Amino acid sequence: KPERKRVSKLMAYILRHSPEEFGLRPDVEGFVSLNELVNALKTVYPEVTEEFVREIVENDPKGRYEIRGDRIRARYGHSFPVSLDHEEDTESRFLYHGTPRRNLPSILKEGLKPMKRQYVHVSTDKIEALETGRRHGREVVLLVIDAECLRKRGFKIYKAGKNVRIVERVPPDCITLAV
Numbered sequence: 001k002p003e004r005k006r007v008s009k010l011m012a013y014i015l016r017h018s019p020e021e022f023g024l025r026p027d028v029e030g031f032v033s034l035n036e037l038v039n040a041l042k043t044v045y046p047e048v049t050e051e052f053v054r055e056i057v058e059n060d061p062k063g064r065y066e067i068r069g070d071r072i073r074a075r076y077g078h079s080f081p082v083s084l085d086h087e088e089d090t091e092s093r094f095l096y097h098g099t100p101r102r103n104l105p106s107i108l109k110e111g112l113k114p115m116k117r118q119y120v121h122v123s124t125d126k127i128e129a130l131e132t133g134r135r136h137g138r139e140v141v142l143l144v145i146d147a148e149c150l151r152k153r154g155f156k157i158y159k160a161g162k163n164v165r166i167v168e169r170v171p172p173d174c175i176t177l178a179v
């Protein structure tokens with residue numbers, strides 16, 4: 001039971017908080033592959049197996065985790081943006097992202113590409129978009145994102161709680177500048 005508890009706590013950290021310090025990239029719903037999670041756990045606890053994780057999941061008294069096929073997620077408590085139920089934002093016309101002036105040349109040429117995760121996050125609220133960017137640098141530049149542009153190229157936009165939205169990427173065509 002001690003081994004189950006220390007492994008469980010580490011799964012909670014990986015699955016809710018920082019999958020990128022283990023090289024993992026969750027999908028929009030928060031899932032990573034089970035084999036990747038096992039390999040990640042094994043770097044701290046070499047005895048972990050996929051069968052051990054399945055038992056932790058199925059015996060968890062709180063419903064912390066969900067396995068769907070060969071993928072696994074935490075069901076709650078995330079501190080990075082997820083769309084747990086794949087809920088589409090069909091109504092937003094404009095979305096916003098704040099970029100420090102430093103990353104302006106690459107962002108303008110590339111758009112917003114997924115780096116740490118499988119998707120990028122933006123906001124419906126321009127002030128909240130600016131605040132997010134300030135945490136990443138000074139002299140933040142507002143990107144205005146045409147959501148209908150995004151949908152025309154097949155990028156579904158997902159609700160991720162309150163004003164946050166996620167999308168696989170934002171091509172440069174969908175972006176214009178503002179203060």
Ligand SMILES: O=c1ccn([C@@H]2O[C@H](COP(=O)(O)O)[C@@H](OP(=O)(O)O)[C@H]2OP(=O)(O)O)c(=O)[nH]1
Pocket residue numbers: 004005006008009010011012013016062064077
């Ligand atoms: O068997 C276990 C015991 C705890 N945990 C989670 O490890 C953190 C431990 O914090 P604690 O022990 O002070 O409560 C916390 O996760 P957090 O840092 O995301 O809040 C908790 O999650 P929970 O009990 O709230 O579900 C787990 O996964 N499995």
